[PDB]
Each structure stands twice: as C-alpha cells, then as structure tokens.
Motif scaffolding. Structure first.
Motif, mmCIF file in Angstrom:
data_model
loop_
_atom_site.group_PDB
_atom_site.id
_atom_site.type_symbol
_atom_site.label_atom_id
_atom_site.label_comp_id
_atom_site.label_asym_id
_atom_site.label_seq_id
_atom_site.Cartn_x
_atom_site.Cartn_y
_atom_site.Cartn_z
ATOM 1 N N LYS A 1 21.842 47.090 12.949
ATOM 2 C CA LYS A 1 22.966 47.883 13.435
ATOM 3 C C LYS A 1 22.962 49.278 12.823
ATOM 4 N N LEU A 2 22.586 49.390 11.547
ATOM 5 C CA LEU A 2 22.538 50.703 10.912
ATOM 6 C C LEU A 2 21.518 51.605 11.592
ATOM 7 N N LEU A 3 20.340 51.068 11.912
ATOM 8 C CA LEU A 3 19.331 51.873 12.588
ATOM 9 C C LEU A 3 19.744 52.206 14.015
ATOM 10 N N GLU A 4 20.487 51.315 14.671
ATOM 11 C CA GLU A 4 21.035 51.638 15.984
ATOM 12 C C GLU A 4 22.025 52.792 15.889
ATOM 13 N N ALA A 5 22.998 52.687 14.982
ATOM 14 C CA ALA A 5 23.981 53.753 14.828
ATOM 15 C C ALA A 5 23.333 55.041 14.345
ATOM 16 N N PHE A 6 22.293 54.936 13.517
ATOM 17 C CA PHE A 6 21.561 56.122 13.087
ATOM 18 C C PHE A 6 21.022 56.906 14.275
ATOM 19 N N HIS A 7 20.777 56.232 15.400
ATOM 20 C CA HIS A 7 20.293 56.871 16.616
ATOM 21 C C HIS A 7 21.383 56.997 17.675
ATOM 22 N N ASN A 8 22.651 56.973 17.266
ATOM 23 C CA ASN A 8 23.778 57.130 18.185
ATOM 24 C C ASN A 8 23.731 56.089 19.300
ATOM 25 N N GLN A 9 23.392 54.856 18.935
ATOM 26 C CA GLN A 9 23.354 53.741 19.866
ATOM 27 C C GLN A 9 23.929 52.515 19.177
ATOM 28 N N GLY A 10 24.525 51.626 19.967
ATOM 29 C CA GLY A 10 24.971 50.355 19.455
ATOM 30 C C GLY A 10 26.381 50.004 19.873
ATOM 31 N N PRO A 11 26.837 48.813 19.474
ATOM 32 C CA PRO A 11 28.235 48.451 19.742
ATOM 33 C C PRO A 11 29.226 49.249 18.918
ATOM 34 N N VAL A 12 28.910 49.526 17.652
ATOM 35 C CA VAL A 12 29.857 50.240 16.802
ATOM 36 C C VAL A 12 30.033 51.669 17.296
ATOM 37 N N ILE A 13 28.952 52.285 17.778
ATOM 38 C CA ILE A 13 29.065 53.613 18.370
ATOM 39 C C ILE A 13 29.911 53.556 19.632
ATOM 40 N N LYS A 14 29.781 52.477 20.406
ATOM 41 C CA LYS A 14 30.613 52.320 21.594
ATOM 42 C C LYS A 14 32.082 52.196 21.217
ATOM 43 N N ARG A 15 32.377 51.479 20.131
ATOM 44 C CA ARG A 15 33.761 51.353 19.692
ATOM 45 C C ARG A 15 34.352 52.717 19.363
ATOM 46 N N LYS A 16 33.557 53.589 18.743
ATOM 47 C CA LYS A 16 34.006 54.954 18.494
ATOM 48 C C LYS A 16 34.276 55.679 19.805
ATOM 49 N N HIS A 17 33.354 55.561 20.761
ATOM 50 C CA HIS A 17 33.517 56.247 22.036
ATOM 51 C C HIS A 17 34.720 55.707 22.799
ATOM 52 N N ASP A 18 34.929 54.390 22.758
ATOM 53 C CA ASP A 18 36.064 53.800 23.460
ATOM 54 C C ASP A 18 37.382 54.272 22.861
ATOM 55 N N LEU A 19 37.473 54.296 21.530
ATOM 56 C CA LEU A 19 38.695 54.764 20.886
ATOM 57 C C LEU A 19 38.981 56.216 21.249
ATOM 58 N N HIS A 20 37.944 57.053 21.291
ATOM 59 C CA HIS A 20 38.132 58.441 21.701
ATOM 60 C C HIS A 20 38.548 58.530 23.161
ATOM 61 N N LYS A 21 37.898 57.754 24.029
ATOM 62 C CA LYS A 21 38.224 57.807 25.449
ATOM 63 C C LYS A 21 39.640 57.311 25.706
ATOM 64 N N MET A 22 40.079 56.292 24.964
ATOM 65 C CA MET A 22 41.457 55.835 25.092
ATOM 66 C C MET A 22 42.429 56.889 24.579
ATOM 67 N N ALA B 1 43.062 59.318 27.361
ATOM 68 C CA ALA B 1 43.905 58.847 28.451
ATOM 69 C C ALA B 1 45.372 58.766 28.057
ATOM 70 N N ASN B 2 45.681 58.876 26.766
ATOM 71 C CA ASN B 2 47.050 58.854 26.269
ATOM 72 C C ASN B 2 47.466 60.211 25.712
ATOM 73 N N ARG B 3 46.786 61.282 26.126
ATOM 74 C CA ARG B 3 47.151 62.613 25.656
ATOM 75 C C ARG B 3 48.558 62.983 26.107
ATOM 76 N N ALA B 4 48.944 62.564 27.313
ATOM 77 C CA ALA B 4 50.289 62.827 27.803
ATOM 78 C C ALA B 4 51.353 62.079 27.012
ATOM 79 N N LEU B 5 50.958 61.099 26.201
ATOM 80 C CA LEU B 5 51.873 60.364 25.340
ATOM 81 C C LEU B 5 51.887 60.907 23.918
ATOM 82 N N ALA B 6 51.331 62.100 23.697
ATOM 83 C CA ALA B 6 51.284 62.664 22.355
ATOM 84 C C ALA B 6 52.645 63.149 21.877
#
Ligand SMILES: Nc1ncnc2c1ncn2[C@@H]1O[C@H](CSCC[C@H](N)C(=O)O)[C@@H](O)[C@H]1O
Lengths: 326, 205
Positions: free
Chosen positions: B174-195, B198-203
């Motif tokens: 997983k560390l080598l995956e994230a080191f290359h901006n790939q993996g599930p943990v990187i997706k979790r970061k992207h999902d949290l940012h994308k969510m 979508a809630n910017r109007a709720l700021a």
C-alpha cells in the motif's frame, strides 16, 4: 348495503379503457373493483387484499369474469413479491386504485371484532387468520405499558386523553382479560365521568362513543396500516406505468397526509399543519424540493357529495387524491 | 499526572546544545538560563538522540500497536521498511539505466511521501439541522491531516479483504501504491475532497 365510495369519480378519474391493465391493492368487498369491470368490458384487472375472506369473494366473483379479474392475497408490502412471482416487475399498470380503511363487510360482521357497538371477539385484524400469530387488538392492550399504549392512542388515534384512556386499560386488564369489544369500550368510558360517553362529536356533528378513537388507534397499530401504506404507494409507483393514473382514498388525516406528502415529495418528517408564518420562520433560521414525480389530476382533494354523505356516513371523510406518474 | 505542573518536557536535540553562544539572540540566551532553574521530566523510552530517530515512523508504530505490544508493532514496522527496500532493489536491477535514475530505493523517503500523498486537505463534519443530519466541509488542521493519513493506511491494511497476507507485505504494497498516487487510501482522500466539494453550498452552517 354499502355503495362504493366516490365510485363515479374514481371511474372517471381512471377512465378505464381497452388495452389497459389495472391493479387494485384493496379489493375488500369488491364494489369498486366491480364498478371498474363494468364500464370497460375489455379491461384487465388485478386484485389484492389482506383479508382471506376478501380474497375468497374475489375468487368467487372471478367466475363472473374469468380472466378480466385476477385475485391475489397479501399485504401491501408483500404485494410486490406476490406480483413479482407473476413476473410483471415493470408492471406498466395504467392505474393503481389504493382504497384505504376497513371494509364494510369487515366492520359489518360483528365476529371480526371491528365494531364497538356490537359484541365480537376483540380481533380488529383485517387478516382473517392467514397469519394466526399476528397479534390482535386484545393482545396489544393487555401487553403494552401505559407509556407504550398511550403512544398508540396519541399518534394513531389523535386522542388527547391518551394517558387517561391508557391507564384505565392497564387497570382493567389486571382485574380481568380484555377480550371483547364492548368490554374495552366500557373500560375507556370508565376513564371519564359517565356523561362523557357521548359528549364528543364527529365532524358530521353526530354524537360518537368516547372510545371511537381507541378502536381506530388499535386498528391502525394491529394492521400497521400507516407503515404499510408508505410501502404500498412506493410499490405502486414502481409497478405503475408512465402516464398512468393513480387514485387513493384517505378517510382519516394520518393516511391523507402520507398520500399528500408522497405525491408531492414533501418530507414525511416535516411538521404537520405548517402555516405560512411557520414556513417563513423555519427557513429564516437556515438562511444565516426535488422534482415532482407526479402530476395531480385534480389539484385539491375531492370529497363526497353532501347528499351522498347522508346516504353513506361511513365514507363522509373520503379524500380522493389522484395523480399521474412522471 | 505524577509530574507537577512545574516539570517541563525534555528537549532531546544534540545540535540545540552545541550551538555556539555568539550565534544566540538575547531571547534565546534567556530561555537557556531559565531552563537551568526548571524541573525537567525524565526522557520517555520512546525517543532518543539517535541519528536514525524518525518521529513520524515512531508515531505510525504506536498507531499500529495492539494492547501495548510495542515489540510486535515495531517488528512489523521494520519488516515493512525492509520489504519496501527489497521491492525497490528488485525494480532497480530490472530497469534500464535511464529508468534507474527515477527509482527510489530509500524506504523512509517512500514512507514519508506515501503518507503526504494521502493527507486530506479538507474534511467534513456531521452537523444536525432540524432533526436531519447534513455534513459540512471544513479546513483540516495540520495535526489532523497527518493523523488521518496514518489512520487510513493502517485501517486499509487491517481490512478483511486481505486474506492471509501478512501485515509487512500488505503495508509495503500500500505504501508503494500511495507513493505513486494510486491505491484505495489515495481514493479515500479523493472521495473526501470530492464530497467536500459537493457540500460547498453547506459551508455557511
Ligand atoms: N396493508 C394492506 N394490504 C392489503 N389490503 C389491505 C391493507 N390494509 C387494508 N386492506 C384491505 O383493503 C380494504 C380496504 S376497505 C374496502 C374497500 C374495497 N374497495 C371495497 O370493496 O369496499 C379492506 O378489505 C382491507 O382489509
């Protein structure tokens, strides 16, 4: 005899025509179902009911029209599975007629236990023993605590005196079992002074027994009509054709609200009877609705003609909400 | 605490003490004469002056520790660092002279960069409004971003999806995956940012 409530409106509303398939989620006596198989001789129809006695009537009445009417048995929630076994998952049903409440036959037969005036076993269960383990109203009153039973009356019966009418039930059950309709009616009356027995009045302004709100309350908790109504409408929508006319009939406010808040997208957790003043106050706090899936044929709720009310007082409160799927 | 409020935390830094006097400012001269009168807490067993001391890896080791079993937690850590280094030496020898220049073989550089690629800039808070719950986006402090990167990595490796794979192989992968901006943990970061977009109007809540 009980004439089908608002039969003229429901027939015009659905305009049954050849080449159209329709569903009926509450066959009951079948007066509405038969009024729909009379206008259009080429109609296709499906029936359903929670009462096996009602399902037998449909089976017996199926002789009159062999295939134009198809009888089914089960609750609203179980309706999708029952109809899914037939295989009509898309359904493309032109109209779903979801009549609501208790059948005339159910409450005219004292044995069924729905009538407080007569003396029958305190069943008050639309189910006719199809599930012999389903609790009856007698079971509900003998088991639940004052707080629990009071909530049944308050939320489902719209009964102000929920604590007073529930305490009497708790005391009465300890002295003896509550197993008959009149036995309960007397207990509820005993919570109030003797004159209270007929002080309350209906919207028709005719005296009603002081326990008419406990028979309705238990009727809706034994048969879970309210929760089953939400699934029943949802299932109809999934099985309802685009451009197909839905027609519901709400005889009391609680069911009428769900039909209103379902055909209009309003959240079911919103406050009831919200005024324009309260609506402004609600949204002012946040300052710091989704597209409708229906087209209401008649914008405002229809109601029975005043002359027809006198003929059939049971149906006085029938509120017809028609809609077309979008 | 068994330390009175008078006790100050120890400063374990050899350089801080060898620094000449002339380089010191009048403020830094006062701090040094003050500590000579203060009580100092005993140095914890965790941190030493060793040149190989890494506070980030020591923290990741504690977040992996179950029931005070530091020996086992640290064993898993060093086995992961060895597994990362061996995987990179294998990728290095199998590569061409040109690609070899871009291949990182230092597991500490990979470990640090792998976590920095998983840090979420912005997060969400579950807020209640009118008996209904709606999440609200908010900036994340530096401490929270670093902690969440280590909690997501450890959580992913403890996931039951991995069947019979030992932790040093899971974490190294997983560390080598994230080191290359790939993996599930990187997706979790992207999902949290994308969510949180979508809630910017709720700021404003
Ligand atoms: N959840 C549910 N699922 C299916 N049928 C239900 C139901 N709740 C009530 N019913 C039945 O629906 C009917 C509503 S009252 C009777 C109306 C009927 N059209 C008639 O011929 O008069 C009753 O038979 C009642 O037992």
């Amino acid at each position: 005899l009980h004439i089908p409530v608002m039969v003229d409106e429901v027939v015009h509303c659905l305009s049954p025509q050849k080449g159209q398939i329709f569903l009926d989620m509450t066959f009951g006596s079948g007066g509405h179902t038969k009024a729909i198989l009379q206008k259009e001789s080429d109609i296709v129809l499906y029936a359903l009911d929670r009462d096996p006695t009602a399902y037998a009537l449909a089976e017996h009445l199926s002789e009159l029209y062999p295939k134009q009417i198809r009888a089914m048995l089960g609750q609203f929630s179980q309706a999708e599975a029952l109809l899914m076994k037939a295989g009509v998952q898309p359904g493309t049903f032109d109209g779903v007629l979801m009549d609501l409440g208790c059948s005339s036959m159910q409450l005219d037969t004292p044995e069924r236990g729905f009538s407080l005036r007569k003396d029958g076993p305190l069943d008050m269960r639309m189910d006719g023993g199809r599930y012999p383990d389903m609790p009856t109203a007698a079971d509900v009153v003998n088991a639940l605590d004052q707080q629990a039973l009071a909530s049944i009356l308050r939320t489902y019966g719209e009964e102000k005196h929920a604590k007073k009418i529930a305490s009497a039930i708790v005391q009465a059950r300890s002295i003896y079992p509550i197993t008959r309709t009149q036995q309960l009616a007397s207990i509820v009356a005993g919570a109030f002074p003797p004159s209270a027995i007929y002080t309350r009045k209906d919207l028709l302004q005719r005296s009603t027994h002081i326990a008419t709100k406990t028979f309705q309350a238990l009727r809706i908790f034994v048969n879970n009509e309210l929760n089953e109504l939400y699934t029943g409408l949802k299932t109809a929508q999934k099985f309802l054709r685009p451009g197909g006319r839905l027609v519901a009939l709400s005889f009391h406010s609680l069911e009428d609200r769900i039909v209103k808040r379902f055909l209009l997208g309003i959240s079911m957790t919103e406050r009831f009877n919200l005024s324009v003043r309260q609506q402004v106050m609600k949204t002012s706090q946040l300052g710091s609705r989704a597209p409708l899936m229906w087209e209401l044929i008649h914008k405002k709720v229809l109601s029975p003609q005043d002359q027809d009310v006198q003929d059939n007082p049971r149906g006085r409160s029938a509120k017809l909400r028609a809609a077309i799927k979008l | 605490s068994r330390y009175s409020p008078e006790f100050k935390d120890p400063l374990i830094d050899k350089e801080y003490y060898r620094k000449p006097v002339e380089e010191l400012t009048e403020e830094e001269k006062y701090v040094r004469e003050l500590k000579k009168t203060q009580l100092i807490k005993a140095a914890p067993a965790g941190k030493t002056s060793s040149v190989f001391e890494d506070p980030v890896i020591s923290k990741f080791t504690n977040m992996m520790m179950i029931g005070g079993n530091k020996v086992l937690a640290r064993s898993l850590m060093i086995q992961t660092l060895e597994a990362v280094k061996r995987k990179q030496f294998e990728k290095y020898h199998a590569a061409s002279a040109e690609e070899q220049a871009t291949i990182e073989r230092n597991p500490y550089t990979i470990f640090h960069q792998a976590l920095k690629n998983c840090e979420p800039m912005i997060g969400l808070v579950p807020i209640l409004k009118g008996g209904r719950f709606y999440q609200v986006p908010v900036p994340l402090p530096d401490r929270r971003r670093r902690f969440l990167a280590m909690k997501w990595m450890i959580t992913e490796c403890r996931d039951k999806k991995h069947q019979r794979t030992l932790m040093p192989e899971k974490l190294s992968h997983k560390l080598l995956e994230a080191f290359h901006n790939q993996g599930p943990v990187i997706k979790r970061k992207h999902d949290l940012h994308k969510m949180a977009e979508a809630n910017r109007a709720l700021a404003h809540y």
